Amino acid sequence: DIKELAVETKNFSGAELEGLVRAAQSTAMNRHIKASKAESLQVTRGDFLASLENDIKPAFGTNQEDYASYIMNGIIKWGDPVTRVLDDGELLVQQTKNS
Amino acid sequence: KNIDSNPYDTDKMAAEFIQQFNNQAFSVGQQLVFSFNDKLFGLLVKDIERQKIEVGLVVGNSQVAFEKAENSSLNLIGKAKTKENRQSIINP
């Protein structure tokens, strides 16, 4: 569904969209080249998913490696203050989003 | 001596062959020379025709399947049986 892909990608650039489509088509073609019938070629949603996940780093987008680097042991609720701070951050987030 | 990679439409060769060699005999393994647009080609008979035959007669209503010879640089584009498709995947 084109609508799902359009909704998912945000702050992308046209060049990046073309790169995504090329990546998906290349992945499908290489899968069939691996084969076990070159006439039943098709592109599957799984190819889009994998290509988006493991490639295409939008310049104005969100990275995950930096997160994985900064936070390294998750969060353990050892007392009230952690809950207090987490619950208070959402107020600022909402204020900046709505007003 | 005059090999080239220039693209030549195959349908033109098919029509010229049918028109020029109408009512002619061809046997498997036979060789002949075909004149097309003031150029000479060495044609080798490979298969003749669902009954299978080794020697037969050329008629206007027949079909012709041109296949470029081994290592031939001739780019036989068009609607003929140039064998431009590598069935399955070579996967070197």
Swiss-Prot record, chain B:
Q: Which residues are annotated as modified residue Phosphoserine in the UniProt record?
A: 88
Q: What are the N6-acetyllysine sites (modified residues) in this protein?
A: 1
Task: State its location(s).
Answer: Cytoplasm
Could you tell me what this protein does? Answer: Required for vesicle-mediated transport. Catalyzes the fusion of transport vesicles within the Golgi cisternae. Is also required for transport from the endoplasmic reticulum to the Golgi stack. Seems to function as a fusion protein required for the delivery of cargo proteins to all compartments of the Golgi stack independent of vesicle origin. Interaction with AMPAR subunit GRIA2 leads to influence GRIA2 membrane cycling.
The UniProt entry's sequence similarity note says: Belongs to the AAA ATPase family.
Self-association and partners: Homohexamer. Interacts with GABARAP and GABARAPL2. Interacts with GRIA2. Interacts with PLK2, leading to disrupt the interaction with GRIA2. Interacts with MUSK; may regulate MUSK endocytosis and activity. Interacts with CDK16.
* Protein's name in the database: Vesicle-fusing ATPase
- What organism, scientifically named, is this protein from? Cricetulus griseus (Chinese hamster)
**Which taxonomic lineage does the organism of this UniProt entry have?**
Eukaryota, Metazoa, Chordata, Craniata, Vertebrata
The gene coding this protein? NSF
Coverage span on the entire protein = 105 to 211 of 744
